[PDB]
Design a binder for this molecule. Structure first.
Ligand SMILES: CC(C)(Oc1ccc(C(=O)c2ccc(Cl)cc2)cc1)C(=O)O
Ligand SMILES: CC(C)(Oc1ccc(C(=O)c2ccc(Cl)cc2)cc1)C(=O)O
Length: 270
């Protein structure tokens, strides 16, 4: 692990810390309850949802969502969070060496297919087996409450929890996750790329730094890099299924609206 490779890892780590409001260190501090006796407000049923939404009234009233079905309200708010994360991933990508120099349409394409893989990767940091932190760690929506919603909404998040439990068992830290997210974005085989050669060059550099970083930071998890290559493949499959579910909601749910700022990402994705 050469000094230049360590420096690239720390600079990507820095960009990740400066661009994402929530990181795994903060998440685990809250989920563990060590730094405080004031835990997040728990949304575990329809009544505690409605209580939480008293705080979120202005968010709901903004788009006239407040009289919608609870399932629609919940995932309106979740969409708003995705849009926020997409904005942060877009700034973060500037710190990947070479990304900003790519053809603008290639940057758009890399983000189009990459953001949700990174989103579900990073979501793992705010999940445990019982639920997920929401609202910058201030609330906690239980896994069972999400499974209790009417179909198809009860099937949206459960496969993300299933992915996260195995991902979290890898015990990645934020230095690892920042390079993983960088590697997710630099995939050379997204549909519609223009300069595949330039991108593969950029990808090989990030994947090389990632492998050596993992070997240095988790010396006792010898095949951690191969394990994370498989997670990258699992995430691409997870996102493909998510897109198909989004498509089914679009076709079968009349009163649910796809956030303007996510319509373009999903348009013709898979
Ligand atoms: C500033 C504030 C409160 O920031 C939020 C950040 C994240 C979320 C969520 O992701 C969320 C999703 C579903 C529920 Cl049920 C509750 C919360 C909501 C609000 C807002 O924008 O009003
Ligand atoms: C992770 C998340 C929030 O997952 C979704 C979950 C539910 C919906 C919807 O409720 C919906 C509403 C209208 C349409 Cl047309 C399609 C879907 C959208 C995305 C995302 O992808 O950011």
């Amino acid at each position: 692990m050469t000094a230049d490779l360590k420096s690239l890892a720390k600079r990507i780590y820095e960009a990740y810390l400066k661009n994402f409001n929530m990181n795994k260190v903060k998440a685990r501090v809250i989920l563990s309850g060590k730094a405080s006796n004031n835990p997040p407000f728990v949304i575990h049923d329809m009544e505690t949802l409605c209580m939480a939404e008293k705080t979120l009234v202005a968010k709901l009233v903004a788009n006239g969502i407040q009289n919608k079905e609870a399932e629609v309200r919940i995932f309106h708010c979740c969409q708003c969070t995705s849009v926020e994360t997409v904005t942060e991933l877009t700034e973060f990508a500037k710190a990947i060496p070479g990304f900003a120099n790519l053809d603008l349409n290639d940057q758009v394409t890399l983000l189009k297919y990459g953001v949700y893989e990174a989103i579900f990767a990073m979501l793992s940091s705010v999940m445990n087996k019982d639920g997920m932190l929401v609202a910058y760690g201030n609330g906690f929506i239980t896994r069972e409450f999400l499974k209790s919603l009417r179909k198809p909404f009860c099937d949206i998040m459960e496969p993300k929890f299933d992915f996260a439990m195995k991902f979290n068992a890898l015990e990645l830290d934020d230095s690892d996750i920042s390079l993983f997210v960088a590697a997710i974005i630099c995939c050379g085989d997204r549909p519609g790329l223009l300069n595949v050669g330039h991108i593969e060059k950029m990808q090989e550099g990030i994947v090389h730094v990632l492998r050596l970083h993992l070997q240095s930071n988790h010396p006792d998890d010898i095949f951690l890099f191969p394990k994370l290559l498989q997670k990258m493949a699992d995430l691409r499959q997870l996102v493909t299924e998510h897109a198909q579910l989004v498509q089914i909601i679009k076709k079968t749910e009349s009163d649910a609206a796809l956030h303007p700022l996510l319509q373009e990402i999903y348009r013709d994705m898979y």
